[PDB]
């Protein structure tokens, strides 16, 4: 179980750690988060009380280093940093734990939600989507645009998700125009799975990471990416059976975790209705269809 200490909390802020969140008051004696489960990626995220605009946060994996948060009064945000002096860090953490100035990662033992949301998400892949190689953790916020959005403007601050475009030469074989447009199996299995992602695990990982960025930061391009990756599977007539079954589980936990009040903006009516009711895989997502029908029947 690992710890992310906070130097201080000088401004009032709502702090998220994965699917949990705490309100911290201005200059409240908050000094971090302990008992963070080892084995998963995690995200710590922030929304300032005075500007409910720009949610922002850091993806990290405590196995890769000792990380802490420190407010920067010049750039006006909570920044993640790495402490390279291992003894200096253990001493900071132990003092803060002794003074009980840390919240405990509040995981119920029965609860597999975070595992189920991050099953295929790997820090090394995050770091290729979010390019900043001098850090071991990755900053994401509400406003960052994706490579694809940029094509249609600062590249250093882009989300380098895999570009998916159903009306592109990459997606459509010369001479198989109608076939490839109506049955995207070639594009899914040969171009994307065999070619770019190499395996279904890396594809699901990017899908899960795009959803999490949409949910936690309201990142619109991430939402576009999540829906595109779902649609590409559902619009393929030929998908490995293990992928379909895993997809149903992945989407089930995503829909389960989504705030009920955000379904209006994070859920694309066309994609979901097409995927659950018209697509080749209309009958392959039983769990996801059941939770969607009981939780958001208005959308459908």
């Amino acid at each position: 179980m690992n710890t992310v200490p906070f130097t201080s909390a000088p401004i009032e802020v709502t702090i998220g750690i994965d699917q949990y969140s705490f309100n911290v008051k201005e200059n409240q004696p908050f000094h971090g988060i302990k008992d963070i489960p080892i084995g998963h990626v995690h995200v710590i995220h922030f929304q300032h009380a005075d500007n409910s605009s720009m949610r922002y946060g850091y993806w990290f994996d405590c196995r890769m280093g000792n990380f802490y948060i420190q407010y920067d009064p010049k750039d006006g945000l909570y920044k993640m940093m790495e402490e390279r002096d291992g003894a200096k860090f253990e001493n900071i953490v132990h003092n803060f734990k002794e003074r009980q100035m840390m919240v405990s990662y509040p995981k119920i033992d029965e609860d597999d939600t975070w595992y189920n949301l991050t099953e295929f998400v790997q820090m090394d892949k995050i770091r290729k989507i979010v390019r900043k190689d001098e850090n071991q953790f990755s900053y994401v916020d509400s406003s960052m645009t994706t490579v694809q959005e940029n094509e249609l403007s600062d590249p250093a601050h882009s989300l380098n998700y895999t570009v998916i475009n159903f009306k592109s030469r990459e997606a459509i074989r010369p001479g198989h125009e109608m076939e490839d447009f109506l049955d995207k199996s070639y594009y899914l299995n040969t171009v994307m799975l065999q070619g770019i992602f190499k395996n279904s695990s890396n594809y699901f990982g990017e899908l899960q990471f795009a959803f999490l960025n949409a949910m936690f930061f309201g990142n619109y391009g991430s939402s576009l990416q999540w829906h595109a990756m779902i649609e590409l599977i559902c619009s393929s007539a030929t998908v490995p059976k293990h992928m379909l079954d895993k997809l149903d589980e992945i989407l089930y936990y995503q829909i389960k975790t989504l705030p009920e009040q955000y379904s209006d903006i994070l859920l694309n009516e066309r994609v979901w209705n097409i995927c659950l009711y018209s697509s080749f895989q209309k009958n392959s997502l039983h769990n996801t269809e059941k939770i969607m029908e009981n939780k958001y029947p208005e959308l459908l």
């Binding site: 009306k167 592109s168 030469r169 459509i172 125009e177 109608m178 447009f181």
Partner: protein, 237 residues
């Protein structure tokens, strides 16, 4: 974006463009089977691809053999149209290739866009105009060549005959759409108007009769009367 009443003069500027109409690509007669079920029999169709500035018509005849053994023909017909239009563009010299293709039915947008991926600079556009190009098979010489075809065939026409020697493209297109609108609303009456005077003939190399300017005014007036009448009937007004 979409072509409509507001940007109508764009059709007659000097940027090459084509209208594509797919209405008559997949044509069937519906009939009863011995067992009393219903079945369709396809007949030859055509893609209607028209330069509205010059009148050049690229009539690609769609022979019934293209449907043999195929499923979901009305969907295939859109993609076959898109395939043939793309092949036409590729066959043309670069300086003859269109800068825009306007589809008369929105369901052609995605099929044509996908077939034209190699041509990213050619804009594929819908239109809000209700154009009467379905009535192309009411032009006797076009209907005849489609029905007689025994194999796929492209036939080239000028749908304006020699009118551009005397009138502008805008006026020629207006005459064409009025003629076709009349033939669509009441084919029998429209055709009666066009041939009532046996002394006015159709040249071998033309589609329509050789009316003088004054006779075209009478003809055009007779066509508008036909269209309004029919309309009050259709709607009782």
């Amino acid at each position: 974006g979409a072509m409509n009443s507001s940007n109508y003069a764009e059709l007659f500027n000097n940027d090459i463009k084509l209208f594509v109409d797919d209405t008559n690509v997949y044509r069937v007669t519906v009939h009863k089977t011995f067992e009393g079920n219903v079945a369709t029999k396809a007949i030859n169709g055509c893609i209607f691809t028209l330069n509205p500035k010059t009148g050049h018509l690229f009539l690609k005849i769609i022979h019934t053999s293209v449907w043999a053994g195929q499923k979901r023909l009305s969907q295939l017909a859109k993609w076959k149209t898109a395939e043939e239009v793309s092949a036409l563009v590729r066959s043309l010299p670069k300086e003859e290739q269109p800068k825009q293709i306007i589809v008369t039915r929105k369901a052609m947008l995605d099929p044509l866009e996908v077939h034209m991926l190699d041509f990213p600079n050619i804009a594929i556009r819908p239109t809000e105009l209700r154009l009467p190009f379905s009535a192309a098979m009411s032009i006797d010489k076009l209907s005849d060549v489609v029905m007689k075809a025994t194999e796929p065939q492209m036939v080239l026409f000028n749908i304006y005959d020699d009118w551009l020697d005397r009138i502008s493209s805008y006026t020629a297109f207006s005459r064409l759409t009025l003629l076709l609108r009349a033939l669509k609303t009441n084919e029998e009456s429209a055709k009666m108007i066009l041939l009532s005077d046996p002394t006015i003939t159709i040249k071998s190399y033309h589609l329509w009769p050789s009316f003088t300017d004054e006779q075209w005014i009478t003809i055009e007036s007779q066509m508008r009367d036909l269209i309004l009448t029919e309309y009050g009937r259709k709607y009782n007004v």
